């Protein structure tokens, strides 16, 4: 059946982001659309489920020279006393049937945590210890020793923006939307490319997808510079180099791992 065609119509305009990027892959005629998707009331219903007699009646009494309003009328329609008990037990039973479809841890080296991932004679301790011991026999020099006008002023100058220890542009906005669209475009298609890359997948069926994905990386990125060229030749300002890293680094990973494949063989 044409299941895919119906799915495309539902998402054709309901969600812009999903369809927007898929078309872009075909706007420039990059690759076929087959690989795109291949890789990636209540009251009547309750009676419909609950009472089988109504279900049988509805099929046989399907609207024919009648009205739905008339059908609704037919719903509500000592011996009579027993009917309530039987109906409720039957009704309750039908509801029930309707909902029933047929290690202590141990370690060898705990010191490593104490000196964790963060990376990096004897007489000197004695000599230093004695010297400091006699240092504070004179105390309360606060009057002048703590600070001086020159020392204090020098600190203020340093704290100034020009001074040391105090080091200290949204012009493009319309282009921002295109980059975000491109960022999603890159993010959308790298995801599939990187979906199988981390896993070695030493199998032809799984590896074939890598080869198709690996080749598809060039096809998608073949059209990328053309759009980049137009944007770049506007003012030569606010260069976009980050977007190149994802494609260039994707190439390097592709080339390196592809080269590594030959070595393994």
């Amino acid at each position: 059946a044409n299941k895919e065609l119906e799915e495309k119509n539902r998402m054709l305009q309901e969600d812009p982001v999903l369809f927007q990027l898929y078309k872009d892959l075909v706007v420039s005629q990059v690759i076929s659309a087959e690989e795109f998707w291949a890789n990636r009331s209540d009251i009547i219903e309750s009676i419909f489920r609950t009472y089988p007699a109504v279900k049988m009646k509805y099929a046989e009494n399907v609207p024919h020279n009648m009205t739905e309003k008339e059908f609704w009328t037919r719903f509500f329609q000592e011996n009579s006393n027993a009917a309530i008990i039987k109906r409720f037990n039957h009704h309750s039973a039908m509801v029930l049937a309707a909902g029933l479809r047929k290690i202590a841890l141990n370690l060898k080296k705990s010191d490593r945590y104490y000196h964790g991932p963060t990376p990096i004679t004897s007489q000197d301790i004695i000599n230093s210890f004695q010297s400091i011991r006699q240092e504070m026999e004179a105390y309360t020099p606060k009057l002048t020793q703590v600070l001086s006008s020159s020392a204090a002023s020098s600190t203020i100058t340093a704290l100034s923006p020009g001074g040391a220890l105090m080091q200290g542009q949204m012009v493009p906005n319309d282009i921002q939307s295109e980059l975000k669209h491109l960022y999603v475009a890159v993010g959308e298609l790298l995801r599939h490319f990187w979906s199988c890359f981390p896993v070695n997948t030493p199998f032809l069926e799984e590896k074939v997808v890598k080869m198709k994905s690996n080749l598809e990386r060039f096809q998608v990125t073949k059209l990328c510079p053309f759009q980049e060229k137009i944007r770049r030749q506007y003012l030569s300002t606010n260069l976009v180099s980050h977007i190149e890293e994802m494609l260039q680094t994707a190439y390097n990973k592709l080339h390196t791992w592809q080269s590594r494949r030959l070595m393994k063989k």
Partner: protein
């Protein structure tokens, strides 16, 4: 876990016993030491049997000569099956401590219908039909014909059992009904008769009350062999009803019409016999001159001479005359008639039937029936019922009454009148138990006060002990809601039953409670007719719909088939998160039969005091006699029946294992001191005055709080 009781050292399998258990064993030992019949109450349904059983095992070993055998009876076979498991567990623990087998045998008896291995009776389920087939297979003629080894199906299991079962008795072991059936199959012996033989030497024998009360069957299997036996009843609070029902016999127009047709078949059978077999069968007349069982107890039973009735032609006319008198006396249209001694005089004068010849009619019928080589007794079973009634009236009527109902209740005019012979005192049928057995312990739960039982049953108990369960956590949280949100009397009085507010209040209570009560809840009404009216009133209003939205609701009907299916669905709902509200009648067979455990009937609701229709004459005769004799007020007994019965159905939620469960009484009457006094000790003492008159909404709030405390673990 050996217990050094004051009387002796008693082995106990489980880890710990509550303080009430210490009182239980010593109290039981006191009666056993005194060798006198007594009555006691213990709340816990589970653990009571083992505690009761544990002392007997220790007592038997300490004083084997004092007590011969243990006769522990249970109300229903499904409940006796779990009892033997407790005994089996205890035996293994006791046997493990000893380290070797001991001369101890335990088994449970039952009807051939429930247990058997013969294929022919397997498809049949009716109890009467099973006996007819088994009797025919085991009939003397078949046994005599079995010797000839002619071409005819002979039940092999009994034939080889007599040659084998008689010679070798089973040394020891515990065999439940399911296990016993397998043993018979492998050994090719009757699971029924083999157990019957074992009663001669069986330390513990357990069976239902109907095997120990009705003289027709109980006497034969309960022979004097048990000169000094510790006979015990379990949950025998409604012992009188079972005991009285055994004596009570009902004769109806439909039954009478069947008897007339059966009698005609009996006449035809005699005619065939006369032309075919006369001399050989006539020898039984000499046996009769020389000199299904009679319902007369030991002393009452008489076998002096057959009397005037000595031949089939003469005896059949005797029944023909008696049947006609009952037929005419039953067809009379008038108010309900009572005539215990006058019926015998009226029958004797009307159709010239002396009582003494009539006393042996039932026994003569069986003897004559045997001579007829009938195919089965099931077809003629109604005739025997009339014969049993025929002899019972002619035997004694001091503590009995013949009640005739030309018009039945619930029908403006019915052409099927029923002749009732309901008894009035249960002491008559239970009397032989007390003399034959040195001591009887009536152990029961939800027991309304003991002092009445000696009045109802003519006996002198050694002790009257009431036990309240003692636990680290207060499992049961009873309450009475006599006032609703409208602060209006909610009593389900007969005159006040028609009140819409009272009906509305019950719906409000159930609706609100269902919101807080987790999966599993049961509601008990006073009668089916009242239950339908309350359901209909809720159905017309939105209360029932809201209850349905809150939880699933199930109602109970008279037919068992609907009840069984609905109950099975109920248990399914509790297992899932849907939950179910099972509306039932307190006096309905469903309530007594079913047991409620953890997450089953969590909040048992007692809608109104359970009372029977006072217009029922049969109850009046029973009620009137208790006022006439034994000095019991008419209202006292009527309240007693409700209080004892109300506690019966609501006490299941605390079965055992300290599974939290609350009980709510939706009636201000229970708050009355008289009702509380008749309330069982364990339920009564926990109940306090502060929560005695909780409002419908106030009761809900505390119920929610109660669940919180019980919800958390220990």
């Amino acid at each position: 876990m050996k217990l050094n009781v004051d009387g002796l050292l008693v082995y106990f399998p489980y880890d710990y016993i509550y303080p009430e258990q210490f009182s239980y064993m010593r109290e039981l030992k006191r009666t056993l030491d005194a060798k006198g019949h007594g009555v006691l109450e213990m709340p816990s349904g589970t653990g009571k049997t083992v505690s009761l059983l544990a002392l007997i095992m220790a007592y038997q070993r300490a004083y084997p000569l004092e007590v011969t055998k243990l006769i522990y009876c249970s109300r229903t076979v499904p409940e006796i099956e779990k009892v033997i498991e407790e005994l089996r567990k205890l035996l293994n623990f006791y046997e493990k401590q000893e380290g070797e087998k001991l001369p101890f045998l335990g088994l449970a008896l039952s009807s051939r219908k429930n247990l058997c291995i013969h294929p022919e009776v397997t498809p049949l389920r009716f109890g009467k039909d099973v006996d007819g087939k088994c009797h025919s297979l085991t009939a003397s003629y078949v046994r005599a014909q079995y010797q000839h080894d002619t071409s005819l199906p002979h039940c092999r299991f009994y034939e080889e059992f007599d040659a084998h079962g008689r010679e070798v008795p089973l040394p020891a072991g515990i065999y439940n009904l399911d296990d016993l059936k397998a043993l018979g199959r492998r050994q090719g012996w009757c699971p029924y008769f083999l157990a019957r033989y074992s009663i001669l030497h069986a330390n513990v024998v357990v069976y239902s009350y109907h095997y120990l009360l009705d003289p027709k069957i109980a006497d034969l299997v309960s022979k004097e062999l048990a000169r000094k036996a510790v006979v015990v009843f379990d949950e025998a609070h409604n012992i009188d009803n079972v005991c009285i029902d055994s004596m009570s016999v009902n004769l109806t127009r439909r039954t009478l019409d069947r008897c007339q047709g059966n009698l005609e078949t009996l006449q035809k059978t005699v005619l065939r016999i006369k032309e075919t077999d006369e001399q050989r069968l006539r020898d039984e007349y000499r046996r009769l001159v020389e000199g299904a069982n009679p319902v007369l107890p030991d002393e009452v039973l008489q076998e002096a001479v057959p009397g005037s009735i000595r031949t089939a032609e003469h005896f059949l006319g005797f029944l023909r005359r008696l049947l006609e008198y009952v037929k005419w006396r039953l067809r009379v249209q008038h108010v309900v008639q009572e005539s215990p001694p006058a019926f015998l005089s009226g029958l004797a004068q009307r159709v010239c039937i002396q009582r003494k010849p009539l006393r042996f009619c039932a026994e003569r019928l069986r003897s004559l029936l045997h001579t007829l080589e009938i195919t089965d007794l099931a077809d003629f079973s109604p005739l025997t019922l009339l014969a049993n009634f025929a002899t019972l009236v002619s035997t004694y009527a001091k503590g009995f009454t013949i009640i005739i109902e030309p018009f039945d209740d619930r029908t403006p005019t019915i052409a099927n009148p029923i002749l009732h012979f309901s008894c009035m005192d249960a002491s008559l049928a239970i009397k032989p138990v007390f003399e034959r057995f040195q001591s009887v312990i009536i152990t029961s739960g939800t027991l309304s006060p003991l002092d009445i039982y000696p009045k109802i049953l003519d006996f002198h108990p050694v002790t009257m002990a009431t036990f309240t369960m003692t636990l680290a956590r207060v499992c049961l949280c009873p309450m009475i809601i006599g006032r609703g949100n409208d602060q209006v009397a909610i009593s389900s009085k007969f005159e006040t039953r028609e009140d819409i507010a009272v009906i509305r209040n019950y719906g409000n209570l159930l609706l609100e409670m269902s919101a807080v009560v987790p999966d599993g809840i049961v509601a008990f009404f006073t009668s089916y007719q009242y239950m339908e009216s309350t359901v209909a009133s809720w159905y017309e209003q939105g209360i029932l719909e809201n209850i349905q939205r809150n939880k699933l609701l199930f109602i109970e009907t008279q037919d068992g088939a609907e009840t069984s299916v609905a109950l099975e669905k109920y248990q399914e709902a509790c297992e899932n998160g849907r939950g179910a509200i099972l509306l039932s009648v307190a006096r309905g067979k469903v309530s007594e039969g079913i047991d409620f455990v953890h997450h089953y009937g969590r909040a048992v609701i007692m809608f109104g005091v359970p009372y029977v229709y006072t217009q029922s004459r049969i109850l009046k005769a029973r009620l009137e006699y208790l006022r006439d004799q034994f000095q019991i007020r008419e209202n006292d007994f009527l309240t007693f029946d409700a209080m004892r019965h109300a506690a019966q159905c609501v006490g299941r939620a605390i079965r055992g294992k300290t599974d939290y469960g609350l009980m709510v009484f939706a009636d201000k009457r229970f708050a009355r001191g008289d009702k509380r006094g008749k309330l069982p000790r364990w339920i009564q003492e926990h109940l306090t005055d502060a929560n005695l008159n909780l409002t419908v909404d106030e009761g809900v709030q505390v119920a929610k709080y109660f669940l919180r405390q019980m919800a958390q673990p220990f």
